[PDB]
């Protein structure tokens, strides 16, 4: 049904024994970082610009449109502190959540075998045996043997009968919960509106005006609710990608459609795995970075990968093995919630999050990646596809230190990056809106330059600042590519 | 330096939507289960044999040997009540250990900057600028630059100077810590015997009376500590496995000596990261793993890899993914530690853990696996491997059941097993000290036999056996290999 | 449409330089004699086994019954002098013909331009502008613009009009031709019966009743050709193996059934040329062979490849050539017609031809040629074909000097010689007949076995054999196969 | 010691059947024609140019240099009314010769088993007991038991006994020979001159002054043997390709030293065939064509291949299968002598040869042969290398119809064509040596252009006259390779 992957890797004993000492940013895979009050001042973001941020994450399930503009304005300012780093701003939208309703004394210990009834009316202040849900469409969405989880899946519900405004449930098992906890519904459909009227005024509000790159849309259920939010960003959004947030059963089971409405894929693991079980997570995981991969599409693994980090000053060795196989599996992005949102060791986390990236990315045999990739992509390419697959085949030939591409839209450096070549993808554009997305793709680094100039000299410009930013130096080879389409090997002298 | 690795996987909608419910211990992958109060009674014992216990963990860095018989007569039991699940045997033994000396306050607080003295009069009681170690070759070992972990790396020391009976160091970072902690010497080979006398006795008076099939050596450094167990362990323990755990940056060094030596490797990952970097240690699983796949020597995955459920009913998502990308390595068995000897969810360790293995062994491209073994073996191979080759090759070629082998020693089913068949090997010995060796191997699953029995009267008992214990079916094919040397397919027919 | 092909050879510069000095008989390719007045003696039959020959060829297109029977008992008598070299005997049925009339002066200068008429009417004495044809559907089956070849193709005529009892056409070329010349309908099905009442004598009253082993058809252009001499053949032939003999447009095109209905094939080259533009020939011979192949059915190249030898002593560098090839192309044998039948270098031409082909098959990569027989041949295959495939690759693995395939059938043996293994493969059968059909396959060695014998005994009776006749020594391996289905390895020992 | 080789070939029904009507100039696989009375008229040179002729060979064995001046001038006018045609130019020397003496009755009748004497002293009338011979040195050369050819190899003597001025030999077989014959010393290095005063005339006299692109050097023997030719044509014959012509076991033993020096080889068969056994000549051949090609040297594949063509209208079917193998093979050119030279069907030879090497070009699985080329080639490769490997690579993936290579010195056309493209090599130089000299690469086609122009202009005319041509159409693809170093996609559009 789905697909198939290989993994390629070559580990020595120096790079067990040897410390790594490069550049955090100069990393292929790019880090999403969540903002918040532990990072809201300037001082802390440009420490996480050093440590290895390349997108920020405005999370609006939380904070107002005020909380969000002095935390956009502090990093526009921490951008201009940073200039060699043009940082991609995302907004995440809260989209349709499910909510138990108030309890009359704020706790209850549901126990297992009781019976929990479970009413539309969300004024009721519910106890052990009636508790209100937001989601009115409940009773015509569950049915009898669904299963209903509460409060992050601290206790599960068989459902044993569906009402016109209730539904009665057996508690499975026993556990003590609050009010306005969240709820979840394994295996169903939710209906409710992939955006609300509170997530429209974010996109065309915030969005839009502050010039936001991507929109990380929570539970996409099917590829309408992509066309939806396509439509809804109209012309003045033409420009904002759309990186649905995989977080359900039906967002599985349609994935193909979603991906190819999408610009993107970010995968909530978390949240996914309130849906499916713990052991099949991981199946998802690789499954998806592996569609992704062979569309080109970029792929974000989310949304906590160092979570115990967010207390401690130092990860757990699950964490970091998690983060260092996510990369190996050929996820183009990895995320920071609460680690950098609201943590004690936001720079802590990105520092040792950029330092895993690095050992993984020494890892892969890109010469075996490349042939995988060759190997199971449809046979009729187009120009654009196979003189991209030349300037990557020829990097990997002599050793080329980067790709050069010159692009608009970011077309160009999108083909590029889907080959994955061992070098970075220096990607040139005038748009500030390409140079500004172009970041969720794994390996490209952007550099604006000014409209309406010569190839020869903007490829002769990037080759200077390459040089400047320690790119690349004399006596290498760079790979340029622009266009009708052309791939050209420069060598750097004097 | 090392070497390359392949993994390959085919993942299915119907993989990720559809729950699993086979057997646990149908699984290939076996569990490592350590023994303690938790899982003292032979009750809970069953249960962790229904889960998916494979080999139970003696560890003998606590507890008397009164401690471990109790916990071995009580393993016996459970062994009685489960008569087709014959189960590995393992000694930890103590190894050597470095611990700091006692305090006045029994609190110290170092802080960053300061300097504190370590000196080797263990009877010297400290305080926040002296310490006492109980490894008294500590100034001969670490040098100017070195650095000194305390306390599960609570706190990191710059040697500074070293003097015959102490040395001076800088505390790199504030941290308290209490008496008695551990200490580890990164990059620094320990000067102390792999095997006390207190290892000695729990080696010739309980391993070899109690009738233990593996010795896990804490803290192996060299193949010279490998023979030494061997030679100690002489013909009264020649047909105990000596399994090497690797935890410092010497067992990596010398890891290909080690290896030759050893019947197999246990990657104590834990005590690893206190030696190297902690984005390193993945670096060193995947190398271990892929260098025992090689050889054909099993490799255990440790210690602790589901350390959050020794309090929480459910792992951590980032625990789940590590044991299913260890299996995804190639790990013959997976290992458990506090969450079975004193947590409060044992059997619900076990059990998810169990289910991991399912769902990524389900993964595995095999014939892609079969073909990178195959491919990356060196050229000249004996006639036994040829024949093992064959077995495993048929099996897939014919969608076999089950391989069937006859072996006294276990080499017949080792080399099978070296080429990861899809299906169960069933290995038939009358050797009791096969029949639990081999335990460790991934895939194989034991009978014992009579001695002096035809090859096609035990062949036939085993077929009729594998019939009742539902692991082949009328209509299967299934191997059978022994000897010189055959392979044969027989039809399960009537 | 038809199929793909890989070879793949290592040629070292010791092959080039050093002579061969092995057995000519122990070459894999198997030689086809055609037997006339040149080697008609016992004594120069003796030479061509000493030289290579495998298979007689009784060409039935001249002499009787009586010519054939004094040419088979000279054939046993030779056999008789040469017991361990057990002869196929091959039938050529004269098949369908078509010839030109008679002339009144025996004599004709067909000129280019000139109109030719061609009448049914076979009594009529022809000239240069009108002459008869012995096939009197002629004017039904060709059409205006069809090319009609005459005497060899020594003249072309395009058809003009087509009549009840003649056709006009136009002489392309100028030549001279005489009486009774053979014709030839390229891109037309010649609709004369594939078996006429003298080859129905034959095969019933000859082939049958002599024991012959194969029935060479001429001319088989559908499988209900085939079909028709199976029928004919009834249970009293049902031991004969049929080999079609493409000839012709129709054999091609009806390739595929024909061969599945066919126990081998035998490409007639020259009788192809009179219908195939010539720079097409080796098109057809490649994929025929192809196709042959991956079936597993034994193919013959065909029917005169040292065509000069007939009347030199030493071939042309062409024919040398072109021998080699066909072997390297994958053909099963290679067939002599002329240059044993009655020229003056009968046992010089088999020589040349055996070493030839010992040179060919020191070429061959034989695992490269495993695994594109592999990656050909559709997935899912029997266990009988999964085991010959193991016995082919344990014997290249461990360099084993023979494969001993028991067989009653002769199936065993085909499957193994279908993935041409480096080495002899020796069949053992009680079947008279199957170890003189055997023949045709390459690389296979018959011997003739008791019936009523444990596998154990004639194992050792062949590998004792095998010893005397030099095909294998004391230190080597040997694969033995047979049955439910077993493989087996020995070692040669005392 | 040699090297490995993989052909790969897809033969359709389709091509068997359809017959081929493109143009015979647009043929890969080049042509040597060699000159003659047959031929001597401009009227017969251009049809042997519209039958695919693209090197003309002076044979300098015969004929003296106004012989060959009257042939020159007559292919140039030729050249003429053929502009669209640049032929390549080709001297093959005399080089040294071996001959036996004058005879008192003009014949001699060796008999098998009788001794014969062979002397240094030319002016001995000879007899059947004693016969000169041209080689003074050949008493120091042979040694007792070397093998003496006289005659094509007419007879063949042992040598029994060297002395200073005669040897003594056994005839080996007996045969009738004349005056003057050639004789061959097998597995002996001939101690001749490679380059004779006359040999050395030719060379600076006529080679050099009428501008041959070509020097076929008979009898190469060593490296020394090229490096001597090297400085003979010295600064004025810089741009003249040495092709050495292996015809012995010397040179065979010497070849990579030999093809090191040399700018591409010829395979003298039937020369080699008086040095070497008959059934060795393939082995010989496909490993010169797989070293060459390795190397991106052209070879070509002499000196007779359509033989019998010179007597018949029609090749035997040996010759047709031997020319398409030979391009299956790799070879760059295949050449004819005495078809062309003095035979009857010269325009004919040449037709069918034209034929031959489109039905097998037709054939080749070029993805396949790439990838062949790419697994095989030393890995460390040039910038250069590498983007020609681009323009091969790219024009196969989107089909293109041509690759269009900008060239002074014809290098990176000869790269390009190293990697075997599908497609035409279209290569523009505004040296007149370099677009007569790249004739000897298989698919490669010249167009003289003006010097001091730019490369877009230059490629732009290109286009428009592949346009005229037929070599290209409007909706193709065509790649642009020049340079630092450039690839480029262009697609042919009004
Ligand atoms: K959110
Ligand atoms: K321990
Ligand atoms: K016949
Ligand atoms: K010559
Ligand atoms: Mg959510
Ligand atoms: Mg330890
Ligand atoms: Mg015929
Ligand atoms: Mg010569």
């Given at each position: 049904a789905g697909a198939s992957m290989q993994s390629a890797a070559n580990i020595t004993l120096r790079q067990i024994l040897e410390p790594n000492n490069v550049n955090?940013?100069?990393?292929k895979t790019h880090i999403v970082c969540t903002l918040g009050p532990a990072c809201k001042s300037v001082e802390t973001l440009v420490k996480l610009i050093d440590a290895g941020m390349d997108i920020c994450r405005?999370?609006?399930?939380?904070?107002?449109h005020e909380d969000h503009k002095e935390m956009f304005n502090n990093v526009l300012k921490a951008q201009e502190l940073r200039p060699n780093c043009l940082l991609g701003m995302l907004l995440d939208t809260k989209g349709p959540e499910i909510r138990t309703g108030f309890l009359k004394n704020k706790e209850v210990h549901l126990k297992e075998g009781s019976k929990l009834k479970l009413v539309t009316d969300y004024e009721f202040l519910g106890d052990e045996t009636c508790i209100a849900c937001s989601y009115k469409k409940l009773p015509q969405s569950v049915k009898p043997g669904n299963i209903i989880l509460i409060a992050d899946g601290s206790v599960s519900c068989k459902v044993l009968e569906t009402h016109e405004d209730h539904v009665i449930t057996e508690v499975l098992n026993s556990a003590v919960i609050g009010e306005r906890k969240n709820m979840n519904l394994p295996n169903v459909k939710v209906?409710?509106?992939?955006?609300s009227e509170k997530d429209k005024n974010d996109i065309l509000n915030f969005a839009i005006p502050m010039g936001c790159n991507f929109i990380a849309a929570s539970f996409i259920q099917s590829a309408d609710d992509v066309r939806l939010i396509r439509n809804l960003l109209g012309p003045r959004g033409r420009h904002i990608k759309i990186i649905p947030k995989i977080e359900n059963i039906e967002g599985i089971i349609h994935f193909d459609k979603i991906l190819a409405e999408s610009d993107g894929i970010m995968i909530a693991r978390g949240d996914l795995g309130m849906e499916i079980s713990p052991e099949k997570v991981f199946l998802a995981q690789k499954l998806m970075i592996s569609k992704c991969n062979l569309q080109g599409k970029p792929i974000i693994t989310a949304t906590?990968?160092?979570?115990s980090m967010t207390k401690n000053p130092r990860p757990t060795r699950a964490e970091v093995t998690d983060v260092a196989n996510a990369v190996l599996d050929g996820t183009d992005a990895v995320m920071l919630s609460g680690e950098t949102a609201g943590g004690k060791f936001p720079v802590e986390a990105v520092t040792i999050m950029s330092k895993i990236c690095l050992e993984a990315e020494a890892c892969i045999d890109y010469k075996l990646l490349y042939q995988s990739l060759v190997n199971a992509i449809?046979?009729?390419?187009?120009v654009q596809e196979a003189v991209a697959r030349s300037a990557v085949e020829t990097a990997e030939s002599i050793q080329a230190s980067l790709i050069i591409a010159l692009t608009e839209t970011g077309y160009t450096a999108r083909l590029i990056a889907k080959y994955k070549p061992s070098c970075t993808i220096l990607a040139l554009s005038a748009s500030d809106s390409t140079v500004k997305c172009?970041?969720?793709?794994?390996?490209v680094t952007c550099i604006k330059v000014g409209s309406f100039q010569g190839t020869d000299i903007v490829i002769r410009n990037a080759i200077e600042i390459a040089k400047q930013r320690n790119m690349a130096k004399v006596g290498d080879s760079v790979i340029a590519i622009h266009g009708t389409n052309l791939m050209k090997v420069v060598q750097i002298e004097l």
């Open positions: 955090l940013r100069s990393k405005f999370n609006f399930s939380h904070g107002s209906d409710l509106p992939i955006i906590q990968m160092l979570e449809e046979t009729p390419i187009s172009l970041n969720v793709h794994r390996g």
